Design a protein around this ligand. Structure first.
Ligand SMILES: [Mg+2]
Ligand SMILES: [Mg+2]
Ligand SMILES: [Mg+2]
Ligand SMILES: [Mg+2]
Ligand SMILES: [Mg+2]
Ligand SMILES: [Mg+2]
Ligand SMILES: [Mg+2]
Ligand SMILES: [Mg+2]
Ligand SMILES: [Mg+2]
Ligand SMILES: [Mg+2]
Ligand SMILES: [Mg+2]
Ligand SMILES: [Mg+2]
Ligand SMILES: [Mg+2]
Ligand SMILES: [Mg+2]
Ligand SMILES: [Mg+2]
Ligand SMILES: [Mg+2]
Ligand SMILES: [Mg+2]
Ligand SMILES: [Mg+2]
Ligand SMILES: [Mg+2]
Ligand SMILES: [Mg+2]
Ligand SMILES: [Mg+2]
Ligand SMILES: [Mg+2]
Ligand SMILES: [Mg+2]
Ligand SMILES: [Mg+2]
Ligand SMILES: [Mg+2]
Ligand SMILES: [Mg+2]
Ligand SMILES: [Zn+2]
Lengths: 116, 178, 77, 134, 48, 119
RNA sequence: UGCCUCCUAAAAUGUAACGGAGGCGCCCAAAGGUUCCCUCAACCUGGACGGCAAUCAGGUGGCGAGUGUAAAUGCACAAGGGAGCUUGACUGCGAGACUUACAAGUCAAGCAGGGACGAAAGUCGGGAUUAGUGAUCCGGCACCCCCGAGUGGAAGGGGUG
RNA sequence: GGAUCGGGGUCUGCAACUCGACCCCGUGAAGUCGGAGUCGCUAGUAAUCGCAGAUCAGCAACGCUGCGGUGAAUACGUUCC
């Protein structure tokens, strides 16, 4: 049952099943199921087509989805790169941008150990 | 009778009249064929392609595909002659028409982060090539009874003599462009 | 000294070439040009041969000619 | 001058008969050394003549060598009887015929160029002469 | 690896034809319809 | 073009078969040429290139044949057979002209066989 | 050290050196026969993974590809690529040739039998061709029943493979 | 699991980029129990859970010193370290 292109796996409940969407979390699902009237306790294999119509418009008219968040996030990190800011330079060089310690850490922004 | 076709004769032919001044009524370009190709390199390992890239296009294109065999040997690709290295289908006629019709109707606008696809992709004579990256583009194939995701690469070969009229007829057919 | 006899062998000369020239009267079966490959092609009344030998199917006179670039041997009866 | 590779490392001696039919006139420079007898001209002879040219002119002008020593001449090892195979190639040679132009100069000065060219002829195992571009 | 195998006619057991064969390419004892002069006609000539 | 490709391929095919099949004065080439509309046939004897007999589905007696191009091919087959008899020919070699043996060409050949002409 | 290919070799053939180069002592049950169909490489343009080069599409491209295997001669008309059916990778022969000291080696139309493929015409006595081989002797095996040491057998010998 | 990032903010501080803390949404890495080796702990202990304070406008408070909730298993014994 492809909702918007994320293809929810079956045998799952709504409030978390919607969370697989890139851009919709649990707190978001609390309102996607609230403004559409769909109950929290349900199996997605029992989802009605008319109900999928009821949330095939609310999401696209009041939320924002796959693609048109990824494009925005790459767009603004690209803007920081292009403007020559401290954050942009730091993002190019791959070490932490929020002033994290770079002496015995920064492994998350860097890769595995090197051991020169 | 395919409705896109009936409407093709209804308006696109005479629109191509009103746009290009072809001297003879048969100069009008038309999509001659559509070639859908797999180009699978992940079959030379463990030689799995039958129920992955055959029973999918049997439902997608509707016709049983050709297993395109290797032609030369490449050491960098670990490939020898005589291995299944591609899968091809060539679509003509009303069924090709219905395939594009279904694609534009309920298949093409479903690909993720899709906004229209490049119009510069022409080869200079009037044929068009692009690709996809997931089987769920078509209703006919479900996700609870398939393997890993793949994609198909499409040539659409027209009788157009050049790119502007090839693109014109693709637009009139309903292909999105940016 | 150096034992540079690395190349001192050869095969027998096979006596190839044209055996019956133009205008020469031959009997049937008589080989006209023994050769490797089809340096000459069988024309009218000339057979080819398992090793490309170009014999005469019939008696008569050998004649050489050109058939679309291909040079051919034939017999006129 | 050494061929960077040769298909046939052991060839027959190049044949020294006849007047040169190609490379007979001065084609790039305006002065030329032209042979008047047959000889095999080695790469060492060619090089020595070229150095004679270029350090008689010291600067300016330019030198063409329309002769390349790509024909190998073999040599049996020094202390050997006849006939245990062909020797290894060790001389590289150009087959020059009477009339072949061996070297060409372009030089703004006339006498310096002419003297350089004779300086090179004196380096060569051959009778030669200066000819011009008409 | 290419032994000389004889073919015998199935009817009169007459060992008529000798040829060669690759044992690994075809391990089984092969058959061909060959002309049998004793029978005066073509029959199967399986190996011995 | 598709027409050019068909014409070149068909000439290629018929040259291929023409290498081995020649036809002579005593047994000539019965060569076929079917268009989408008509089928012509002609008996060649190409030692001098003199067509000794010919027939087609263009004359009114074949045009008015009740039936389809199978029947209009059997008509021309019998016709070429009868005028081969008239010219004094009973055995020929049959040249497919580069087309597949079958269909209207095979119908013509069978009609030519059934009434005297004996390739 | 035998065989095959080239050059030397002087435009028929042939031609020596401890002259210059390489191959062979096989492989293929299809890579044989036949019928039908096809045309390559390379380059250019466009194309999810995929890039210089995997598959695709369109052009251009007559042979620069390929040919089981060296080289030469050939082969695009294909002998190169593919598919169907097959066993002629026959039996009995063979006019006439090439080559040749001899022994050998080689080609062969065509006739018959019984087949394969083909609608027919036709083609097929292995392989595009030329290496992949060993005289005679002495034996072995299968068949034929030819001889069978007084006679019937047999032994043993003989023929054909 | 909550590092990481984008965006939006609150508070302090004249001032938050170098270099503060806290909050919301979406994003959701390494990590599936860690080798040689090595540490602490005998009872209200280990373990685990919060709370408080000093320093301090604010705070990288997971550091340090304290408070309490639940709350264990084993120790035959000195051969060995
Ligand atoms: Mg030779
Ligand atoms: Mg042979
Ligand atoms: Mg010249
Ligand atoms: Mg097999
Ligand atoms: Mg000669
Ligand atoms: Mg001579
Ligand atoms: Mg050797
Ligand atoms: Mg075959
Ligand atoms: Mg072929
Ligand atoms: Mg044999
Ligand atoms: Mg004979
Ligand atoms: Mg027969
Ligand atoms: Mg038949
Ligand atoms: Mg024969
Ligand atoms: Mg061979
Ligand atoms: Mg003896
Ligand atoms: Mg007795
Ligand atoms: Mg007795
Ligand atoms: Mg006995
Ligand atoms: Mg006999
Ligand atoms: Mg969590
Ligand atoms: Mg992990
Ligand atoms: Mg786990
Ligand atoms: Mg404080
Ligand atoms: Mg302070
Ligand atoms: Mg405590
Ligand atoms: Zn038998």
């Amino acid at each position: 049952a492809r909702l918007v292109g994320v293809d929810l796996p079956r045998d799952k409940r709504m409030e978390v099943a919607l969370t697989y969407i890139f851009g919709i979390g649990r707190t978001r699902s609390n309102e996607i199921l609230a403004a559409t009237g769909i109950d929290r306790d349900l199996r997605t294999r029992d989802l009605t087509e008319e109900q999928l119509i009821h949330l095939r418009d609310y999401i696209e008219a009041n939320l924002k989805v796959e693609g048109d968040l990824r494009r925005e996030v790459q767009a603004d990190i690209r803007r920081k790169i292009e403007i020559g800011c401290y954050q942009g330079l730091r993002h190019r060089r791959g070490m932490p941008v929020r002033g994290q310690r770079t002496k015995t850490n920064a492994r998350t922004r860097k890769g595995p150990k090197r051991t020169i | 009778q395919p409705r896109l076709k009936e409407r093709y004769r209804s308006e696109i032919r005479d629109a191509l009249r009103k746009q290009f001044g072809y001297g003879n009524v048969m100069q009008i370009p038309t999509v001659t064929k559509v070639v859908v190709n797999m180009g699978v390199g992940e079959a030379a390992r463990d030689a799995k392609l039958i129920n992955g890239a055959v029973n999918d296009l049997a439902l997608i294109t509707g016709q049983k595909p050709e297993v395109r065999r290797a032609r030369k040997s490449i050491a960098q690709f670990k490939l020898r002659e005589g291995m299944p290295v591609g899968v091809r289908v060539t679509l003509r006629g009303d069924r090709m028409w219905e395939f594009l019709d279904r694609l534009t109707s309920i298949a093409l606008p479903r690909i993720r982060d899709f906004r229209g696809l490049s119009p510069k992709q022409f080869d200079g004579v009037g044929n068009y090539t692009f690709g996809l990256a997931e089987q769920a583009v078509f209703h006919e194939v479900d996700v609870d009874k398939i393997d890993r995701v793949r994609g198909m690469d499409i040539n659409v070969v027209t009788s157009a003599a050049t790119d502007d009229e090839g693109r014109a007829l693709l637009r009139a057919l309903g292909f999105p462009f940016k | 000294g150096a034992s540079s006899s690395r190349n001192g062998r050869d095969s027998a000369a096979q006596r190839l070439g044209v055996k019956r020239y133009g205008g020469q009267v031959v009997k049937a079966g008589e080989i006209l040009v023994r050769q490797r490959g089809t340096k000459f092609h069988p024309g009218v009344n000339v057979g080819r041969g398992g090793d490309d030998t170009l014999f005469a199917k019939t008696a008569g006179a050998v004649e050489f000619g050109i058939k679309r670039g291909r040079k051919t041997v034939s017999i006129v009866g | 001058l050494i061929p960077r590779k040769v298909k046939h490392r052991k060839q027959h001696h190049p044949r020294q008969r006849g007047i040169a039919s190609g490379g007979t006139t001065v084609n790039f420079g305006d002065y030329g050394i032209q042979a008047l007898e047959h000889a095999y001209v080695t790469n060492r002879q060619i090089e020595s003549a070229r150095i004679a040219i270029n350090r008689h002119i010291k600067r300016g002008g330019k030198v063409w060598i329309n002769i390349f020593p790509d024909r190998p001449l073999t040599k049996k090892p020094a202390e050997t009887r006849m006939g245990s195979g062909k020797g290894s190639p060790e001389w590289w040679v150009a087959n020059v015929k009477p009339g072949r132009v061996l070297f060409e100069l372009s030089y703004p000065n006339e006498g310096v160029a002419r003297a350089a060219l004779t300086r090179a002829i004196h380096k060569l195992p051959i009778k030669a002469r200066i000819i011009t571009r008409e | 690896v290419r032994p000389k195998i004889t073919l015998a006619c199935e009817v009169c057991k007459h060992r008529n034809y000798i040829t060669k064969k690759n044992r690994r390419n075809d391990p089984d004892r092969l058959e061909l319809k060959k002309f049998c002069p004793n029978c005066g006609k073509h029959q199967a000539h399986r190996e011995t | 073009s598709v027409s050019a490709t068909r014409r070149i391929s068909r000439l290629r095919r018929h040259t291929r078969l023409r290498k081995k099949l020649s036809g002579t004065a005593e047994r000539p080439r019965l060569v076929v040429h079917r268009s989408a509309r008509h089928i012509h046939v002609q008996l060649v004897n190409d030692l001098n290139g003199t067509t000794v007999a010919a027939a087609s589905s263009i004359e009114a007696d074949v045009r008015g044949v009740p039936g389809d191009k199978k029947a209009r091919s059997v008509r021309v087959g019998q016709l070429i057979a009868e005028r081969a008899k008239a010219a004094g020919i009973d055995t020929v070699v049959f040249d497919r002209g580069g087309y597949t043996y079958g269909g209207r060409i095979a119908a013509l050949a069978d009609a030519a066989r059934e009434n005297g002409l004996s390739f």
